[PDB]
């Protein structure tokens, strides 16, 4: 079997494929956990078609998913999650939705004065996200992202610092050639030879780096016959199932990537559409009708000799 919750894996690689096909270099970095948490929480407050579209994309109703996601980010000092609902005093939040918010790790419901202090709100939200991401995401919301007409913002932030159980030796990192879509480039490659999980399937190859506190990092190489191929859920599951102890001479580049995203367009292509229109049914959130205008998402990941440290945040901006 796979090491990932099935519906979550399907959801992740579904969106990942669309994201990868939309960029010219196939380069993408995001947090399925963060986006799924935000979408799941919204689904918990959504009705009729608005809810069915979300449950179809997620492949499940929110309850079991959110419970699983919560467990995935608790019990360790190596990671932390925070979910907050920033809302106008003009919007009364239903007790049941408040309950959904409070069930999330380090959660909160806060008042925001969008109407007369939009920049104050942007500053407050960005500072909260910055704190939650250990300073890795200092400006989730770009200038002008918070307008006077907004009435609520749902945010989720994630920080995780995986520590390799067997770190790469610093003196062994040396320059090598990496074939990028923009040509060959000399970059630093970390080297380590050790027994670790290895798997091959349909031309794909994968190894798994072991880390502390239940964290693991799979690294996949597509077939040389299609260096631009993107993995599918059935493929990764097969790799997990075939993964076996193997002495591997690993050469992995040290790298860091940060990417900001506006997800409404891709989410709509993925099936979620009503949520982004005035026809949205979020009556589970408030008696005051709200809908999602934009969905902001930023992710950052650094991989070096000591481990993998990443941060991500998602913001669903709502209007009346």
């Amino acid at each position: 079997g796979g090491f990932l919750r099935d519906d979550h894996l399907e959801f992740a690689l579904h969106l990942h494929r669309r994201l990868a096909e939309a960029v010219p270099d196939g380069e993408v970095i995001w947090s399925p956990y963060s986006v799924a948490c935000a979408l799941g929480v919204l689904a918990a407050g959504a009705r009729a078609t608005t809810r069915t579209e979300l449950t179809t994309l997620l492949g499940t109703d929110p309850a079991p998913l959110l419970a699983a996601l919560d467990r995935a980010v608790t019990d360790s000092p190596d990671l932390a999650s925070r979910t907050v609902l920033w809302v106008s005093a003009d919007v009364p939040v239903r007790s049941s939705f408040r309950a959904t918010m409070h069930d999330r790790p380090d959660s909160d419901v806060r008042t925001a004065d969008f109407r007369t202090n939009p920049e104050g709100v942007r500053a407050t939200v960005n500072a909260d996200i910055a704190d939650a991401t250990r300073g890795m995401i200092r400006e989730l919301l770009p200038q002008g992202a918070v307008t006077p007409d907004l009435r609520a913002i749902l945010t989720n932030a994630l920080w995780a610092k995986a520590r390799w159980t067997t770190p790469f030796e610093a003196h062994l990192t040396r320059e090598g050639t990496f074939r990028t879509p923009r040509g060959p480039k000399r970059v630093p490659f970390m080297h380590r030879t050790k027994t670790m999980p290895y798997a091959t399937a349909r031309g794909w190859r994968m190894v798994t780096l072991h880390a502390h506190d239940e964290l693991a990092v799979d690294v996949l190489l597509p077939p040389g016959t299609n260096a631009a191929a993107v993995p599918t859920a059935p493929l990764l599951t097969a790799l997990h199932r075939r993964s076996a102890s193997t002495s591997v001479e690993l050469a992995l580049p040290r790298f860091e990537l940060t990417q900001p995203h506006q997800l409404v367009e891709v989410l709509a292509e993925a099936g979620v559409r009503t949520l982004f229109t005035a026809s949205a049914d979020l009556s589970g959130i408030s008696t005051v009708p709200l809908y999602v205008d934009t969905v902001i998402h930023q992710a950052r990941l650094r991989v070096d000799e000591r481990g993998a440290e990443g941060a991500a945040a998602t913001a669903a901006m709502m209007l009346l």
Binding site: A12, L158, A160, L301, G307, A308
Partner: protein, 35 residues
């Protein structure tokens, strides 16, 4: 015994307890410097 040289576009999955914390497709490695 097996050589695994990540010298071209690859994919990375950071996971814990069934959830994908970070999912990436890396094509042009930017060096953050030694740990």
């Amino acid at each position: 015994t097996i050589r695994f040289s990540v010298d071209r576009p690859f994919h990375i999955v950071v996971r814990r307890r069934g959830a994908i914390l970070f999912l990436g497709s890396i094509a042009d490695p930017h060096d953050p410097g030694p740990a």
